[PDB]
Symmetry: C3
Subunit: 418 residues, 3 copies
Amino acid sequence: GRPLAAAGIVVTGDKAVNIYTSSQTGSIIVKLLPNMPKDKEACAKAPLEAYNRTLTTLLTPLGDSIRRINQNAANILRLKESITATNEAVHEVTDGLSQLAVAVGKMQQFVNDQFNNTAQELDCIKITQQVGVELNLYLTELTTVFGPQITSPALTQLTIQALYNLAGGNMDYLLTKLGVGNNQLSSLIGSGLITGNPILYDSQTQLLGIQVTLPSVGNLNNMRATYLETLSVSTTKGFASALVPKVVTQVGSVIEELDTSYCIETDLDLYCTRIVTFPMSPGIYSCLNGNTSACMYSKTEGALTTPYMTLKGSVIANCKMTTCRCADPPGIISQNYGEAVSLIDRHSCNVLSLDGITLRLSGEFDATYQKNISILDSQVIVTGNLDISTELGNVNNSISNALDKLEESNSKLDKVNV
Amino acid sequence: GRPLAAAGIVVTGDKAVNIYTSSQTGSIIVKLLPNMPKDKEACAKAPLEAYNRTLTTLLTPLGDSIRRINQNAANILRLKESITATNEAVHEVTDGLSQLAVAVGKMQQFVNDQFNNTAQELDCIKITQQVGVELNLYLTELTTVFGPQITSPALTQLTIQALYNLAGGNMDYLLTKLGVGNNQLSSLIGSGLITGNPILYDSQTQLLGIQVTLPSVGNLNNMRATYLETLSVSTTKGFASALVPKVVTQVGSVIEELDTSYCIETDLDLYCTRIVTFPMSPGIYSCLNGNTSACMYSKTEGALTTPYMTLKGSVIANCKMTTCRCADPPGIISQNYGEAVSLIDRHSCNVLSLDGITLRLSGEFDATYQKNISILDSQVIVTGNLDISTELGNVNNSISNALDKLEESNSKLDKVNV
Amino acid sequence: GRPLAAAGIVVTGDKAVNIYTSSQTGSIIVKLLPNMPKDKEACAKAPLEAYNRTLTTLLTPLGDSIRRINQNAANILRLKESITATNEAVHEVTDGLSQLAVAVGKMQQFVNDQFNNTAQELDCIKITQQVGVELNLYLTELTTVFGPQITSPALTQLTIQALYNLAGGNMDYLLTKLGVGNNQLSSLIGSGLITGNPILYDSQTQLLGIQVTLPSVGNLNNMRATYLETLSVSTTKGFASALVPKVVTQVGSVIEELDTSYCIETDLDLYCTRIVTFPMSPGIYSCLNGNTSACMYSKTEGALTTPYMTLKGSVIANCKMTTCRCADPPGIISQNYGEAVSLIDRHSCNVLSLDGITLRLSGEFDATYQKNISILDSQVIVTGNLDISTELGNVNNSISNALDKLEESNSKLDKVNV
Ligand SMILES: *[C@@H]1O[C@H](CO)[C@@H](O[C@@H]2O[C@H](CO)[C@@H](O)[C@H](O)[C@H]2NC(C)=O)[C@H](O)[C@H]1NC(C)=O
Ligand SMILES: *[C@@H]1O[C@H](CO)[C@@H](O[C@@H]2O[C@H](CO)[C@@H](O)[C@H](O)[C@H]2NC(C)=O)[C@H](O)[C@H]1NC(C)=O
Ligand SMILES: *[C@@H]1O[C@H](CO)[C@@H](O[C@@H]2O[C@H](CO)[C@@H](O)[C@H](O)[C@H]2NC(C)=O)[C@H](O)[C@H]1NC(C)=O
Ligand SMILES: *[C@@H]1O[C@H](CO)[C@@H](O[C@@H]2O[C@H](CO)[C@@H](O)[C@H](O)[C@H]2NC(C)=O)[C@H](O)[C@H]1NC(C)=O
Ligand SMILES: *[C@@H]1O[C@H](CO)[C@@H](O[C@@H]2O[C@H](CO)[C@@H](O)[C@H](O)[C@H]2NC(C)=O)[C@H](O)[C@H]1NC(C)=O
Ligand SMILES: *[C@@H]1O[C@H](CO)[C@@H](O[C@@H]2O[C@H](CO)[C@@H](O)[C@H](O)[C@H]2NC(C)=O)[C@H](O)[C@H]1NC(C)=O
């Protein structure tokens, strides 16, 4: 209840009681080498060759710690020597063309077998690239999901992902088989009852095997363990402390001291191997129900003992035995006689100064973790800036003048008599 | 032994005793920047520039927390003007060829200095690629081997790989120097005695220094600590519990209670700073040897105390004070009078329901962790599909007709008289 | 002091006293997807597509555990049929040129639109490459900085980097707000008071949210807790042990026993929720000040109790009740009567053998962790080795002979009469 805080007794903890047993075994088999494409191309043989190599460099130590555990007549002749020499000049132009047509034809299948020789080059780079990145993502994924197991041979608390994969996704089913509620997983994992340890590792196949161990818990209703602490308050004796156990468990109208030696405690759940309770004095039970007039006090204390304590980011102090100075909101703190002890939290004070120390009962820290990616523009020297049109045009035009200069020639024959 | 389980006393733990001391220091110096090729090419300057940058973004915080701690006469003339104009048409075809031969020659050293300009491009990409992947593998390798040390300044349990590297591979030698057996490494690492902490980090060289601390253990034979717990069994008094210590150590015929406050316990090994034993009542020693008739009982118990407990995934319960209902294999469970307490495990029951809770004494979970890699086929627009043969052929053929049309011309002169 | 070691009492621990409270909350919001370049190019859509995919495959499990919690006349005619056929041979050479000039022009815009088609290909690969590597560095960076939080839903000890980012770099300011000194951070983080747990995760935006919890500590000067242990030394009784508490706290001239149940201990700092001290016998206080003649002894011990213990990599043993054999430096060890107990460390012995075990008080292990990167030289088939100069030259030269063979023709006409 609450009136028990009128005798220096304050409830610090309140959690449910559970009984567990490590009677659930599993076996997660991890395939270090991902499933390569059906194409089976040896173009990704480069990124993988290095990936598989960094696996042996990373797993061997782990596997090691397991394996060991007339006058005109001269003109008619001159004309002959003129056209017999003209044909001599045409036969050469023909050789220059019949050999240049080869220099162009030879250059055809060249640039063709060089662009087609690049079509298979760039094709490989894109594949190698994708694989190189996709393969790195996996190695940085395993060292996160199964890090704890890779980094140590002995039992290590599993990873959510590792467990998520174990249940095959269907989590609500896994929990039910163990007897765990939805609002109890956070504490279940944070208890070290979900451990795992490597068992068999193959260097060749790169296939890691892990042995999982899960607990079977049985919740106990109507039974809740309560943690109790006490401060110093003046009484009939004078400056004494209330006498109450540290941990108690209640069922209906039965209250007894709980031995937390057989149990693993959390923030809101206690998983116990066994339950051992002890009978408490009748004067104690009477008090814990509300009868504050039943609690016994004693001077079991020294001079260096503190008149306060910490509870859930708060400070519970006796402000009549110590001046509670509230800094941020100026003024001295106190409480009605109904409560022998004052509770100071964030709702009434941000900075407090007690006898000796100065605790800060408030604070806020908001930060952002991001990354600014900047890519460099590597100017590629490769450019398509070949301008041979100035020469090409002078040909498409020079040919025109060669055709008409011939037309005049061929038309000068239309005027020949005989 | 086993007959002690006839008085409600059950052996839960059984481990060897060890004496240890943190008198072994080491120093692992990690080279964050790998050994670059002797070629010293500045083609891998891109992947490294970013890698070295993410190291300072990842290590600075760590280093920070350390730095601060006639009528025919007209024909003879007409023929002249016919061939003087024909040569006029040949001189132009020559200019068109002598300028096209340049347009082709200029295009030669172009595509040549563009394919050769690509031969050094693709060459760089392949290098950059390999480095980019190889360098990522290392960063995802260090955050796994030396993660614990990078993530925290204070002492942190080393990684198998970190230790494996420390011993230089030869592990059997390292253990011998510390006095550790082969079948004792699993517990040795899982004790937190193999810790390490960063000491000196250089931002420039990217060279991390870690201080290792190893224990020197001395095994004690003939001495084994045994953990003992007790349940409630009806006796001369009626509904009482046997009185026996929690931890005891035996040597030959000497049995005494062991103080486990100076020791770190494991699954099968206890590493102790010291050994403190206490003498136990003669009535106790007599019992632990086999004389069950010597053990004393007492009603040190409450009403909320459990009539059972958990042991190695099993449930040891008194099935005469509580109805043990076996679910999976229907039927009530009990045991011969020879054993006051019943042991229920997987070999006799898969699901049990006791007074209050229902524990599951069996379960199997097999899962597989893999990754399906699928690469995309980026169709490269670059193709070698230049078909200039239709035009090329029309030349290799048109030249033939130009050669024979000239042969007729040159043969029409063989029939000239003078 | 030191004279207390003349009664078998040795100081093992010496740390400062602190009062803490979890009254400091923070919220680190992590942007899983980095800030892409302003260019917004879809050329990095490949590496990111896979990166974002491995995030959902890595975070969903985490988010899941939160969402649910004449005769010559014949000659004048023969000459006509000679040049009319010669022009017939020139008109064809013209067609072969006017069609080859097209085969070259068509090949111009081809290799041009294939090199320019590659200029945008290589450009993309370089971008994709840089992004692929830069993006991998981030995923291997987060699984290290926020690994503990990604791997578990419940509270987990933060990472230096995570905290460094929280304080926005300015660390000296953060500590001051909590009341932590510079030479106290190592112990502060290694206490589990700097915890954090995921609270909200968005699958779409890939934005992780973590709730941070920091303590507010108030140092206590003039007060230092001291850990005390005792060995067996012969006295008036004979073979007994000194009687002194395990932990004590002193303030000025006030010495009392300290209850370390409310406190978290470290290597040099104790962070306590509260301080509970107990009064000790006057005979005890007198001794701890120096009056060794005031300490009481008792035979509270068994036969299996050890005559030694471990302290900071050393062994404190009674070398008059046990023969201390120093191995490395041969000889038996002992100490002046002034000190009832001998302290054996590295400064006086490297290997020791006591009654039962043989501890090694010295050792050094230096190792180096590095990586040798070797890149492969993938010979690119793409080469610029087109040598069409042998054919090109035969044209540039054949044209010369065609020009002069025509010059003779055109000069044979200069000798024509009419
Ligand atoms: C990954 O690399 C390791 C490197 O050791 C390879 O291990 C070899 O496995 C073959 C069989 O596949 C054995 O015959 C060899 O003895 C191993 N190498 C040596 C010399 O130890 C392994 O093959 C690689 N995995 C794959 C499938 O690529
Ligand atoms: C990364 O880039 C972002 C976006 O440009 C930067 O965001 C800035 O944040 C600061 C506060 O920390 C603001 O004052 C600026 O206005 C923001 N800039 C803009 C234009 O958005 C951020 O500074 C960069 N991160 C670092 C530290 O390099
Ligand atoms: C890795 O990157 C860091 C970024 O800080 C580099 O640090 C520089 O180191 C040089 C000496 O090599 C110093 O002169 C500079 O002051 C440092 N940079 C600054 C401005 O802090 C470091 O050089 C890089 N490492 C290598 C070898 O590439
Ligand atoms: C990845 O690919 C593998 C191989 O194709 C898939 O394996 C399937 O596994 C399921 C059971 O989980 C079987 O029912 C199928 O027959 C398997 N397929 C084949 C053809 O082998 C697997 O499903 C894929 N992983 C996921 C979940 O995407
Ligand atoms: C990263 O990948 C996830 C894969 O689930 C994407 O999730 C989708 O988010 C869109 C909105 O952006 C939803 O409409 C879809 O329903 C989600 N996919 C499905 C089918 O679950 C997410 O968009 C990706 N992130 C980015 C920004 O690329
Ligand atoms: C990686 O390369 C380095 C540098 O070559 C090697 O360094 C050698 O280290 C050993 C001792 O471990 C020396 O004996 C050699 O002289 C060193 N070699 C040289 C030339 O420096 C190292 O061996 C390589 N690492 C491994 C194990 O492959």
